[PDB]
């Protein structure tokens, strides 16, 4: 929609989009995450995490190492540009970040860091 996107994470470990475009005129960009379904956070948790395509693996490995209680994200990880909390079904969370944190010609990825989900739950984010 205008400088924002609503995205869903379901019980089959799927996001309903796999490509996000952010227009350079946006001062800010907002992602609104929801989780349709019935499974709880500890079985099917999903968060929306954004980093460069280069940093994603490091973010995923260290996130797995943080624990459920840490939302499977390394606290104050410098490589995460923006992220929601980890949510279960029926829950909701949003994040607004400044678009100046992204630069032209850099590849970005969004993904879920919940153990085992990033292999299937990821997509690209692009500044146009
Ligand atoms: Zn997930």
């Amino acid at each position: 929609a205008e400088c924002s996107v609503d995205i869903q994470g379901n019980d089959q470990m799927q996001f309903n989009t796999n490509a996000i475009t952010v227009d350079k005129s946006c001062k800010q960009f907002t992602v609104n995450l929801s989780h349709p379904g019935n499974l709880p956070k500890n079985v099917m948790g999903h968060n929306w995490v954004l980093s460069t395509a280069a940093d994603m693996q490091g973010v995923v490995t260290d996130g797995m190492a943080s624990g459920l209680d840490k939302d499977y994200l390394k606290p104050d990880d410098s490589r995460v540009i923006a992220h929601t909390k980890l949510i279960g079904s029926g829950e909701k969370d949003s994040v607004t970040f400044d678009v100046s944190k992204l630069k032209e010609g850099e590849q970005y990825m969004f993904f879920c860091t919940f153990p085992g989900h990033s292999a299937l739950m990821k997509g690209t984010l692009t500044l146009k």
Side-chain angles (χ1 to χ4, degrees):
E2 187 190 285
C3 294
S4 57
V5 74
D6 298 340
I7 171 170
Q8 289 166 220
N10 64 25
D11 286 344
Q12 285 70 67
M13 308 192 301
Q14 298 165 324
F15 284 127
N16 67 330
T17 194
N18 55 51
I20 296 168
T21 304
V22 180
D23 184 353
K24 292 175 78 202
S25 319
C26 294
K27 268 70 193 170
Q28 292 174 146
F29 187 85
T30 295
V31 175
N32 298 280
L33 184 70
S34 56
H35 182 335
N38 302 89
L39 293 171
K41 197 208 297 194
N42 72 293
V43 186
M44 195 49 57
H46 303 317
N47 47 17
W48 182 87
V49 184
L50 171 75
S51 62
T52 60
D55 288 329
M56 170 176 83
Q57 182 54 48
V59 173
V60 172
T61 302
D62 293 350
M64 182 185 268
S66 295
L68 181 58
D69 65 321
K70 293 298 202 291
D71 278 13
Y72 280 118
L73 254 195
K74 180 214 280 182
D76 305 298
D77 198 310
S78 47
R79 299 168 294 192
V80 176
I81 302 164
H83 72 92
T84 63
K85 325 292 171 290
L86 188 77
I87 60 168
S89 46
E91 293 182 342
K92 187 86 195 187
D93 202 24
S94 315
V95 64
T96 305
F97 55 105
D98 293 331
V99 176
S100 64
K101 288 176 179 169
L102 308 173
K103 83 160 89 169
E104 201 95 294
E106 194 169 39
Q107 314 143 277
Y108 303 92
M109 298 304 274
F110 53 91
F111 44 96
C112 178
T113 50
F114 184 93
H117 293 194
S118 63
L120 318 222
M121 298 193 81
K122 78 294 174 170
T124 52
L125 181 133
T126 306
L127 226 220
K128 84 176 168 193

